[PDB]
């Protein structure tokens, strides 16, 4: 998979520019990297094509570049109609094609709002059901992305990980929500668990403890 | 004009076989490429194959460890994809994607292949809105309903709800106090975990001071097993 920023964000009218690292088997390979626009709800379009190229009818201000194994896409003067997700795409020399992760692209339209997150532990009833699951909470954050992580004690925790897609609030706001599945028993064996939530730069934590 | 439409989607067993099939207008078919691309939910974008114009030659993603042909009637202006064995991580929005394409020029002059047929270009400029697959056994069931109790870090506001885990198929329709609570609601969308059902959140905000003093009961139905549940969440 080719490595794209899980999120950008900046104000209207500011230029903005979204980074591709790729490999020689691809985008350092070759020269036929496309870029696409994914709006809520809505199917893919094309953006850039062959690094710098833009098909017929695409605003000025989408502009597409490379060196060496990454690309980039970047757009000057950001519109709100411009917000959606953005996929980077390669040949490869297997004579395939390859997608970036995506990059949520947010154009400011409300003033910046930090997430309010909460961790419960599980419950007794769910444990006496000999199951655990640790649900993680985050309402009121604005853009609407975020990056959760899970760490068992002071160890990061990847399997076992759930989390929803940030959606839109009766206040406009994002909420997004964060499963932890564990067993009874690892639940009991580690001293704490930590959930983080990355927004806009800033960090907020909150903690549960099986004591 | 140029116009894909998806279609053969809903839900599906595991380890059955399955066939979908796009559906193409306001262009030349037979002269051009097509892929499938898929994207598992809040996941993106993930390239499956691609079949030449003719048809005689087709590429497929190493990852989907050949459970997957593609195939085309160019005759039907149909491009089909097949599966089997399949798996609950085959759950995705299946996209339909022509391979943009055309003569190649030197100097003024344009060159085609034998046939006269377009050269590959490298950039799918024609999508179609995918049709969506779902993969669970899972015979309809309810949901059982645990309490997210308030933490006891807070004075402030405090956060408590519901959560309602192991349900099929959606909805689920969560309500609070009986509706009489509607301020700082939030009731979040459903996961589709490796189980096979499915599980969701509900929380609200209140402030510290009314815990103890006010009774909160979040009232979930799901109407397609007709089960009504009523939880108390209290510290
Ligand atoms: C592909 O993207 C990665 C991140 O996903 C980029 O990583 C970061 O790139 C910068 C530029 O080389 C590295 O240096 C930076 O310098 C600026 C000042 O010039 C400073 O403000 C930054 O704090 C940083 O020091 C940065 O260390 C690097 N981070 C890494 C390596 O994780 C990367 O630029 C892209 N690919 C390549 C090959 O650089």
């Known amino acids: 998979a080719l490595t794209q920023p899980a999120s950008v964000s900046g104000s209207p009218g500011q230029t903005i520019t979204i980074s591709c690292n790729g490999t020689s088997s691809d985008v350092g390979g070759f020269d036929s990297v496309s870029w696409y626009q994914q709006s809520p709800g809505k199917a893919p379009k094309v953006m850039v094509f062959?690094?710098?190229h833009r098909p017929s009818g695409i605003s000025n201000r989408f502009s597409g570049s490379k060196s060496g194994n990454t690309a980039s896409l970047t757009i000057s003067g950001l519109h709100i109609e411009d917000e959606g997700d953005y996929f980077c795409?390669?040949?490869?020399?297997?004579?395939?094609?390859?997608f970036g992760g995506g990059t949520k692209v947010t154009v400011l339209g409300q003033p910046k709002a930090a997430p309010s997150v909460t961790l419960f532990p599980p419950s007794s009833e769910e444990l006496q059901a000999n199951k655990a699951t640790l649900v993680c909470l985050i309402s009121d954050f604005y853009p609407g992305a975020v990056t959760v992580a899970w760490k068992a004690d002071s160890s990061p925790v990847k399997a076992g990980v759930e989390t929803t897609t940030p959606s839109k609030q009766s206040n406009n706001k994002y909420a997004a929500s964060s499963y932890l599945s564990l067993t009874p028993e690892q639940w009991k064996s580690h001293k704490s668990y930590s959930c983080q939530v990355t927004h806009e730069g800033s960090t907020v934590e909150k903690t549960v403890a099986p004591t | 004009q140029e116009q894909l439409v998806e279609s053969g989607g809903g839900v599906v067993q595991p380890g059955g076989s399955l066939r979908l099939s796009c559906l193409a207008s306001?262009?030349?078919?037979?002269?051009?490429?097509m892929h499938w691309v898929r994207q598992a939910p809040g996941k993106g974008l993930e390239w499956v194959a691609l079949?030449?114009?003719?048809?005689?030659?087709?590429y497929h993603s190493d990852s989907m460890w050949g459970r997957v042909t593609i195939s085309r009637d160019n005759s039907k202006n149909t491009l089909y994809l097949q599966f089997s064995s399949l798996k609950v991580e085959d759950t995705a929005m299946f996209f339909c994607?022509?391979?943009?394409?055309?003569?190649?020029?030197?100097?003024?002059?344009?060159?085609?292949?034998?046939?006269?047929?377009?050269?590959?270009?490298?950039?799918?400029?024609?999508w179609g809105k995918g049709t969506t697959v779902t993969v669970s056994s899972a015979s309809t069931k309810g949901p059982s309903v645990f309490p997210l109790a308030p933490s006891s870090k807070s004075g402030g506001t405090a956060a408590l709800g519901c959560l309602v885990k192991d349900y099929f198929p959606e909805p689920v329709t969560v309500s609070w106090n009986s509706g009489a609570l509607t301020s700082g609601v939030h009731t979040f969308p459903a996961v589709l975990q490796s189980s096979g059902l499915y599980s969701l959140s509900s929380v609200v905000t209140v402030p510290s001071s009314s815990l103890g003093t006010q009774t909160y009961i979040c009232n979930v139905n799901h109407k397609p097993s007709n089960t009504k549940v009523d939880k108390r969440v209290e510290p």
């Open positions: 994607a022509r391979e943009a394409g055309g003569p190649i020029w030197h100097d003024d002059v344009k060159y085609y292949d034998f046939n006269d047929g377009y050269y590959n270009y490298h950039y799918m400029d024609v």
């Open positions: 062959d690094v710098s």
């Open positions: 795409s390669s040949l490869t020399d297997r004579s395939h094609r390859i």
């Open positions: 079949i030449s114009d003719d048809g005689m030659r087709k």
């Open positions: 306001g262009f030349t078919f037979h002269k051009y490429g």
